[PDB]
A paper describes a structure:
After transcription, the 3′-end is oligo-uridylylated by a terminal uridylyltransferase, TUT1 (TUTase6)910, one of the members of the non-canonical nucleotidyltransferases. The C-terminal region of TUT1 is a previously unidentified RNA-binding domain, and it was named the KA-1 domain. Thus, the present structural and biochemical studies have demonstrated that TUT1 acts as a U6 snRNA-specific terminal uridylyltransferase.
The truncated TUT1 (TUT1_ΔN) was overexpressed in Escherichia coli, purified and crystallized. The form-I and -II crystals belong to the space groups P21212, and P21, respectively. The form-I TUT1_ΔN structure complexed with UTP (soaked in) was initially solved by the single isomorphous replacement with anomalous scattering (SIRAS) method, using the protein complexed with UTP in the presence of BaCl2. Subsequently, the structure was modelled and refined to an R factor of 24.6% (Rfree of 29.4%), using reflections up to 2.95 Å resolution. The nucleotide is located in the cleft between the palm and fingers domains.
Residue numbers in the entry: 145 to 223, 329 to 637, 763 to 792, 802 to 815, 826 to 877
Write the structure that this text describes.
């Protein structure tokens, strides 16, 4: 791993071979699946001991075909409004005590009622496995099955999802908190496949319409019905190779309008967010920087946790990735030993690149006035020489991002013993023809955020400038807001 993987990808044919080989290397072995099966069997044994006729249904990465080594094990246990929450939480505690004290080998048991879907986190010691026990999740089962079904519908699915998933892990786009879940990212890939001119994957509404007799199922008032086998469905007429689909992915999601669009896997289409339509229809839908609808529960934005910085970082990383995929280093292999194809995409991100990818949130203000105030801050309040979404090229011959404290103290003392822009500009000018550091500033139409990328950085001081800008620019615009 990280060594064997690198040479394995570098050694093999074209890009598609790299993606396929990646899937081959990361996926769970037979022994791993045997181990997981046995552990789930034990859990089943103890839960049967407590709950006669209860079924333990594995879901998520286990059954959705996107599994990798050491992945979580998601288990679903199948057996007034605040009273119902309290009842559910108590029940969850009961399951938690069953895990904690009964089933042999399991430790690290933490009940999490506060989560969206309440869950009991567990670790099984002898197998070295960990995961979540869920009481109510029946939608995850069917949508996981839906994911594996997608994998069966077209052979390019697993390679795309695996590669893009690893890439997202690399670019810091995926994880907990504000980031994207692997499920959300997966839904994005699938939606991308549905939106190709020839469709690579059918829309979920098409699967629902196809369905079958007795294959009808309704969970939590939503229609989860899809065909059980991929044989009853006609293949894709899309001839696009893996690499082209990867590049097209990056370019696509880089060019999309995320804020103003709710991406529907059901209709296989982009539904306009503004104004008010989908949130009025399904009534449970949270809207934000990135909106991606679950194929079954239509009141659930799977990306609803994604902050503007994360969406911005996503589209930036995707634009950069597209730029790379247009280079010859991507398409053509290497003679001897050099990194080609998937390798720079799976390689760790440069600190300057990692920083530049994630934009800087700015206070609310009209685009024109915001831009004017920005270039006014760079020009006036900093030593920046600037020149002509919006963008400006900026040059700094000075250390201006650092040394401001001492200079401000000196000025404070000089003034003591004998309005923001002009004063801070004086602070800057009191800090003191080849450019020391040159960088690009960019503002997107929606949401309005400043993106700072490097150009010429001989001494490698760019990240310091980036952090300093992260602190300085918002408060500058903040003070400029109060002059009106
Ligand atoms: O918003 C969500 C998130 C997750 N889920 C359900 O939870 C399951 C967990 O989906 P994950 O986001 O955990 O991804 P994963 O398990 O496929 O991969 P790893 O995290 O193991 O790397 C998914 O398969 C989905 O069924 C939802 O239904 N909605
Ligand atoms: Ba998981
Ligand atoms: Cl597109």
């Amino acid at each position: 791993d990280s060594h064997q993987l690198a040479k394995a990808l570098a050694e093999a044919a074209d890009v598609g071979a790299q993606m396929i080989k990646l899937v081959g290397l990361r996926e769970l072995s037979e022994a791993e699946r045997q181990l997981r099966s046995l552990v789930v069997a034990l859990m089943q044994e103890v839960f049967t001991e407590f709950f006669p006729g209860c079924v333990v249904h594995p879901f998520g990465s286990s059954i959705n075909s996107f599994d990798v080594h050491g992945c979580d094990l998601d288990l679903f246990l199948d057996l007034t409004p605040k009273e119902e929450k309290a009842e559910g939480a108590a029940m969850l505690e009961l399951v938690g005590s069953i895990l904690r004290g009964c089933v042999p080998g399991v430790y690290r048991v933490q009940t999490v009622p506060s989560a969206r879907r309440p869950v009991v986190k567990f670790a099984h010691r002898p197998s070295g496995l960990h995961g979540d026990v869920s009481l109510s999740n029946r939608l995850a089962l069917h949508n996981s099955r839906f994911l594996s079904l997608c994998s069966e519908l077209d052979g390019r699915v697993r390679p795309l999802v695996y590669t893009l998933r690893a890439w997202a892990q690399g670019r810091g786009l995926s994880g907990s908190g504000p980031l994207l879940s692997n499920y959300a990212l997966t839904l994005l890939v699938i939606y991308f496949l549905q939106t190709r001119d020839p469709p690579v994957l059918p829309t979920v509404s098409q699967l629902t319409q196809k369905a079958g007799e007795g294959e009808q199922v309704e969970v939590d008032g939503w229609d989860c019905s899809f065909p059980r086998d991929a044989s009853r469905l006609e293949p894709s007429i899309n001839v696009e190779p893996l690499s082209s689909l990867l590049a097209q992915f990056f370019s696509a999601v880089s060019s999309w309008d995320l804020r103003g669009s709710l991406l529907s896997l059901r209709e296989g289409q982009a539904l306009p967010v503004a104004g008010g339509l989908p949130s009025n229809l399904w009534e449970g839908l949270r809207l934000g920087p990135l909106n991606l609808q679950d194929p079954f529960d239509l009141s659930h934005n799977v990306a609803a946790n994604v902050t503007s910085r994360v969406a911005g970082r996503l589209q930036n990383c995707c634009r950069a990735a597209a730029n790379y995929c247009r280079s010859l280093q991507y398409q053509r292999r290497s003679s001897r030993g050099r990194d080609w194809g998937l390798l720079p995409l799976l390689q760790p991100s440069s600190p300057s690149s990692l920083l530049s990818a994630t934009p800087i949130p700015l206070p609310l203000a009209p685009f024109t006035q915001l831009t004017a105030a920005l270039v006014q801050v760079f020009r006036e309040a900093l030593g920046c020489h600037i020149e002509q979404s919006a963008s400006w090229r900026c040059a700094l011959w000075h250390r201006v991002w650092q040394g401001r404290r001492r200079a401000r103290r000196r000025l404070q003392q000089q003034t003591k013993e004998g309005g923001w822009l002009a004063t801070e500009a004086q602070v800057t000018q009191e800090l003191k023809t080849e450019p020391l550091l040159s960088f690009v500033a960019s503002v997107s139409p929606a949401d309005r955020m400043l993106t700072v990328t490097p150009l010429q950085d001989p001494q490698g001081l760019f990240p310091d400038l980036h952090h300093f800008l992260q602190v300085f620019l918002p408060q500058a615009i903040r003070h400029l807001k109060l002059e009106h």
